């Protein structure tokens, strides 16, 4: 009779699981302690379409901490062990951030960054990109609000 | 004599002497406030473009001084029901201008084309369903490039000379936006510029900045009326800085 | 009991080191390296001493996991459609049998390294407790330690 | 006068060949014997030998047997300390400046004439500390050249060779600092010893890796004589060293 709603519900449950799908705290603590802001947070507003691209673009430096003044970090580095084996620090304005320069050749669902004449980086578009968290959580809200509306119509 | 014509939010106008006037700080009637201002000469006609795309011309001399509350434009103009004046212009009669709607249609014309003495004005630009008039752009150099940015984040650049010159009408499409989408506010002309070809743009999007050098702008150059090129993270632009040598 | 206490201590110390070197430190890189006609950077640095291993491992940062190939023009063709790999895949051009150490602008601390990636970007890389580099030498040490433990165990039982 | 090539075998046999273009390795040696080293010079200039104990000897090439035969035991003309072998040969100008050293990290600058000793027992040129060995003598081609020391531990030190005191004997002064106890146990010592122009480039092959040291990098390693030196990362167990000098 009417399996359109039942099929649409399943579609909403599908995407919701994918977005909220799993899946760092230490970097957050380090950020405020450095008086800086996570690059991921600066990039939390990027759309669902561009999030994978930007996340791939930046490579490992996607986990970077952005501070307006690098000298804020120096004093803390000595003896610092409570952190990932690689810690990225970029000087810039967390309110008006200038992107890094990238020599990039964009493929489908991946990018090829030329780090130097003798070094390349292949970064494929990830499921669950680091960037675009804010837009991702919003989309999940819309889906929830839509799923309930479908449930009454079910 | 140099004058500054001031338009209030409720459609009241006045002519202030000189160009050193602090319009927002002027004296407006209760509930009213600054909307727009334009600087020109007393011999120059002031042009008004309403929200429906009609243009009107008034001689500044016939306007009241900025010493008073001014007067309602309705005294001299008859606008369509529910329409408001959103744009004012004072340029040389030969001044080339870029008219456009947010549906992505537009045409190049001359200031003289907007000059309509009659109180009902003239139908300058025709608006598609739910479309709005773009801020008219003054073309400083006939060799400048036209730059268009859509809400979807697509950009297209081409010599402003490629855009057909008209005296009125809907015009031709500047950048290709699906008529159906435009009429639903799903996409549309977000930004429209005319600038030198060796220009550098700094676009502010939230807490990010996208810097487009002349080299990047080159990659987005193409034929008038095309899609054209989709940009990464270029939606919901907050501010645009233009550097033009 | 001078000797038994000495043997017992060394035996413990040996167990300390063995456990510290054997502690847990993808083979997708192995398959990729073979496909690309290159060799892992970590393999090229498998000879570095226990003392230098953590340094070099920290020095290279994430590119520590790089695949070294004689000519990068070999790899391009394999890149499009490549999903069976880490989200970041490093590719360095060089001679696997005669590889020149990469140049870094680095301020050495203890026990970490601050590398200047760019004028506005730094990378702080602390020495790993179990470095990726120097695996050959590390395993060689572990093996000799096991050989020593049996000697100590035999002697400790005899006194 | 006449160009000659003095050939020394592993068993300490010597012969004076004619000409400077001979295949020494490919020559007739006693059973079990083989080529060890060769040196080119003139028939009128003395050939100097340096044994494993650090003693030097000089022999007039004119008194040596031709390469037509297997030669003669060096013991015929020289009396070496018990268990000693002849390790090095030199044919240079009398005034030629040389760098003598032990792997203990000590040495001195001298002239070729200082090694010239015609008595059977020779002279005690360099004094060796416990378990120390003689370094390959280095011919100083320019007084303003740089001395470069590389230790087994991977430490590097570079200073003007002119800074090392000139002596005729014996132990010499400290070139680079190595704890004596470690040297005597083979835990560390001099691995390489060079004398080269300042604007030189080093290419150090270490296993599957190589280290290129431009003149600007060696500058970093430059210091004062007798200093500890700079510890280089991954500079242990060197396989080969390339040197580019303009």
UniProtKB/Swiss-Prot annotation, chain B:
Membrane spanning residue stretches: none
Top-level taxon: Bacteria
UniProt-annotated stretches for the region Disordered: 221-245
This protein's UniProt keywords: Cell membrane, DNA-binding, Isomerase, Membrane, Topoisomerase
Biased composition (Basic and acidic residues): 235-245
Span list, region Sufficient for MukB binding: 1-245
GO cellular component: chromosome; cytoplasm; cytosol; DNA topoisomerase type II (double strand cut, ATP-hydrolyzing) complex; extrinsic component of plasma membrane
GO BP terms: chromosome segregation; DNA topological change; plasmid partitioning; sister chromatid cohesion
Cellular localization per UniProt: Cell membrane
GO molecular function, one term: DNA binding
Primary residence: membrane
Family statement drawn from the similarity comment of this UniProt entry: Belongs to the type II topoisomerase GyrA/ParC subunit family. ParC type 1 subfamily.
Reported function: Topoisomerase IV is essential for chromosome segregation; it is the principal protein responsible for decatenating newly replicated chromosomes. It relaxes supercoiled DNA. MukB stimulates the relaxation activity of topoisomerase IV and also has a modest effect on decatenation.
Subunit structure, interactors included: Heterotetramer composed of ParC and ParE. Interacts with MukB.
Listed name of the protein: DNA topoisomerase 4 subunit A
From Swiss-Prot, chain C:
Family note: Belongs to the SMC family. MukB subfamily.
Function: Plays a central role in chromosome condensation, segregation and cell cycle progression. Functions as a homodimer, which is essential for chromosome partition. Involved in negative DNA supercoiling in vivo, and by this means organizes and compacts chromosomes. May achieve or facilitate chromosome segregation by condensation of DNA from both sides of a centrally located replisome during cell division. Stimulates both DNA relaxation and to a lesser extent decatenation activity of topoisomerase IV.
Residues of the full protein shown: 645 to 804 of 1486
Domain notes: The hinge domain, which separates the large intramolecular coiled coil regions, allows the homodimerization, forming a V-shaped homodimer. The N- and C-terminus together form the head domain.
The protein, known as: Chromosome partition protein MukB
Stretches for region Sufficient for ParC binding: 3-159
Taxonomic lineage: Bacteria, Pseudomonadati, Pseudomonadota, Gammaproteobacteria, Enterobacterales
Annotated region (Flexible hinge), positions in chain: 24-138
Quaternary assembly: Homodimerization via its hinge domain. Binds to DNA via its C-terminal region. Interacts, and probably forms a ternary complex, with MukE and MukF via its C-terminal region. The complex formation is stimulated by calcium or magnesium. Interacts with tubulin-related protein FtsZ. Identified in a complex with SpoT; IscS and ACP. Interacts with the ParC subunit of topoisomerase IV.
Entry superkingdom: Bacteria
Cell compartments where the protein resides: Cytoplasm, Nucleoid
